[PDB]
mmCIF file of C-alpha atoms in Angstrom:
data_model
loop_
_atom_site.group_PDB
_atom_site.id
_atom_site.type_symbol
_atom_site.label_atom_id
_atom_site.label_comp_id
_atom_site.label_asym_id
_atom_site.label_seq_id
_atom_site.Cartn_x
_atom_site.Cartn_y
_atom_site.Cartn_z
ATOM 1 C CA UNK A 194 8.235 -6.811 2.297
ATOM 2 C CA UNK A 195 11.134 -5.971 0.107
ATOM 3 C CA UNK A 196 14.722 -3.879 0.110
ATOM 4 C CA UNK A 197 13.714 -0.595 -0.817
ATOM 5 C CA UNK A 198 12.471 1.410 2.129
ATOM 6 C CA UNK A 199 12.412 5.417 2.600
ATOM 7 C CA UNK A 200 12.685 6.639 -0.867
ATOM 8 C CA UNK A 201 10.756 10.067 -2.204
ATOM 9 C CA UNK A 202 8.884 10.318 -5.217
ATOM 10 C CA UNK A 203 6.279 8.981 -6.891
ATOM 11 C CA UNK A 204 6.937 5.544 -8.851
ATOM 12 C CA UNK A 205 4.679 4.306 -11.994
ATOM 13 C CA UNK A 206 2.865 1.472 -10.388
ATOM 14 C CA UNK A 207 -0.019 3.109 -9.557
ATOM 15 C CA UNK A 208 0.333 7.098 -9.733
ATOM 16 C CA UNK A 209 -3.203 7.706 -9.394
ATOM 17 C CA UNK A 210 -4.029 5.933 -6.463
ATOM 18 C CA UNK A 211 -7.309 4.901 -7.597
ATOM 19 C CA UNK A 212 -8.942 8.319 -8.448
ATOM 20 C CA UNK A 213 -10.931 8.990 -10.935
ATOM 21 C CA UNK A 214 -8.997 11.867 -11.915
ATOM 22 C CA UNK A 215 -6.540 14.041 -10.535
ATOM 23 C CA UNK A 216 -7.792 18.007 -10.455
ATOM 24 C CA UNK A 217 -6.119 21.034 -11.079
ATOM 25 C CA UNK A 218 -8.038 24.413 -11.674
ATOM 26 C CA UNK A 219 -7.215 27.766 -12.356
ATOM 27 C CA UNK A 220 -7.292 31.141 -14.918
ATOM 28 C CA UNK A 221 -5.903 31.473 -18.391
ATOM 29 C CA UNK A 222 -5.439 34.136 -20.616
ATOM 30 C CA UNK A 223 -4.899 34.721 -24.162
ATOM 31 C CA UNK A 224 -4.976 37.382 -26.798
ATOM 32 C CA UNK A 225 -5.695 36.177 -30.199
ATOM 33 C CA UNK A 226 -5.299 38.041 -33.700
ATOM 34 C CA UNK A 227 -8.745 36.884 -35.458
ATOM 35 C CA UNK A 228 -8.141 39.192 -39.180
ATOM 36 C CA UNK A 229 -10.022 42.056 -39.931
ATOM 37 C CA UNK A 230 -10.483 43.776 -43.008
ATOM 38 C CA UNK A 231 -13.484 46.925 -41.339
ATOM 39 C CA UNK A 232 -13.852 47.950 -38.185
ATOM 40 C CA UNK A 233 -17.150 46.748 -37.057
ATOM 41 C CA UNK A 234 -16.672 43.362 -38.699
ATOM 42 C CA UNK A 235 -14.777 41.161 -36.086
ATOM 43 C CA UNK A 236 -14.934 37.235 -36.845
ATOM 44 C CA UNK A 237 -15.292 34.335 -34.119
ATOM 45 C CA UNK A 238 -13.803 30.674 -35.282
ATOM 46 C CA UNK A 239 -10.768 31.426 -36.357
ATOM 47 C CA UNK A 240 -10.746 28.777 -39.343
ATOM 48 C CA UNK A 241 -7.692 30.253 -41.427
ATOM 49 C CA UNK B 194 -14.584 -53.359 33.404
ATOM 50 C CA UNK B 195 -11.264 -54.503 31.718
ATOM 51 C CA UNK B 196 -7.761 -56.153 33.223
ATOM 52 C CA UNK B 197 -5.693 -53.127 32.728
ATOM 53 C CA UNK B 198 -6.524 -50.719 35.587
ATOM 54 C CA UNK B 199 -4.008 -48.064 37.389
ATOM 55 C CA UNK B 200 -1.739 -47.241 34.605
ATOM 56 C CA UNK B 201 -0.020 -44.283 33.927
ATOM 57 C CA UNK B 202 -0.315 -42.431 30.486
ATOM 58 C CA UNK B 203 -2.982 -40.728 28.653
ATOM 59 C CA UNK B 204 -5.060 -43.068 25.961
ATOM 60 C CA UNK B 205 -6.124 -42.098 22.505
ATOM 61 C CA UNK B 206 -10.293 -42.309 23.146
ATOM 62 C CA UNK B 207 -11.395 -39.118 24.434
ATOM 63 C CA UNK B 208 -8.068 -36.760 24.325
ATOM 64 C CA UNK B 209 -10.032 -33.467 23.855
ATOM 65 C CA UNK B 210 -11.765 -34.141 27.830
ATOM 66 C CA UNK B 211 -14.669 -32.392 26.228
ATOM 67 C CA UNK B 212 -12.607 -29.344 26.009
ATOM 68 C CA UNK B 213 -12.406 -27.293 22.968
ATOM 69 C CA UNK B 214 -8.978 -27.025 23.161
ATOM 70 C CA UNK B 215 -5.189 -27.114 25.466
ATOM 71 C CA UNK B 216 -3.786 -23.843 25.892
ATOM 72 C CA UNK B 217 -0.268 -22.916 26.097
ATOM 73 C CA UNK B 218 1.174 -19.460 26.464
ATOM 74 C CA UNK B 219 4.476 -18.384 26.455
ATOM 75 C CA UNK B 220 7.597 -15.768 25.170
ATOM 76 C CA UNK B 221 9.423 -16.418 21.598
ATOM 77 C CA UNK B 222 12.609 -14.844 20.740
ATOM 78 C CA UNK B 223 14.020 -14.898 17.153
ATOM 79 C CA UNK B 224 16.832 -14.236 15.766
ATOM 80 C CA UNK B 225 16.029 -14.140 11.999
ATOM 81 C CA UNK B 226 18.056 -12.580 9.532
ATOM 82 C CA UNK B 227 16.169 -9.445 7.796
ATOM 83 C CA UNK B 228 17.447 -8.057 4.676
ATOM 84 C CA UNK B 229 16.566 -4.160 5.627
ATOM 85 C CA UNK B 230 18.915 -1.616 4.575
ATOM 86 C CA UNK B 231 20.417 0.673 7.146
ATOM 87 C CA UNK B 232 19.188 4.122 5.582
ATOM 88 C CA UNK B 233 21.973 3.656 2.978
ATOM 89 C CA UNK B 234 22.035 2.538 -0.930
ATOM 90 C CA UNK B 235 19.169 4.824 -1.696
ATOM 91 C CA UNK B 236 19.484 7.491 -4.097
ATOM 92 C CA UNK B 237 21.007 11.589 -3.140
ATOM 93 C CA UNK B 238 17.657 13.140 -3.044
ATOM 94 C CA UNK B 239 16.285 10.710 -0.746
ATOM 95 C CA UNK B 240 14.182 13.591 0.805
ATOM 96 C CA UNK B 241 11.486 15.742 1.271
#
């Protein structure tokens, strides 16, 4: 009803289209460094 | 049961004839000015 036909992309009036939420899944890894001052003594909650 | 008898016209007391309405059918051509583009002033990556 206006001049602006056959753009591409996605404009900010209403991204979401009404869902709830838009989904994504997938797999992440990570190595972390928790300290360690003896071998069988390995701490979880890294809070340093 | 009235002087005025045999004249030509249509009167104003019972237009309808007990019908719910007159039909008419016919073709309309227009000529209106739109203001659609033509595919131009629209941005490079107008595409897929």
């Amino acid at each position: 009803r206006t001049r602006t036909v056959n753009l591409y992309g996605l404009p900010a009036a209403n991204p979401n289209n009404g869902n709830e939420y838009y989904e994504i899944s997938g797999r992440f890894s990570l190595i972390s460094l928790v300290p360690t001052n003896d071998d069988y003594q390995t701490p979880i909650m890294n809070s340093v």
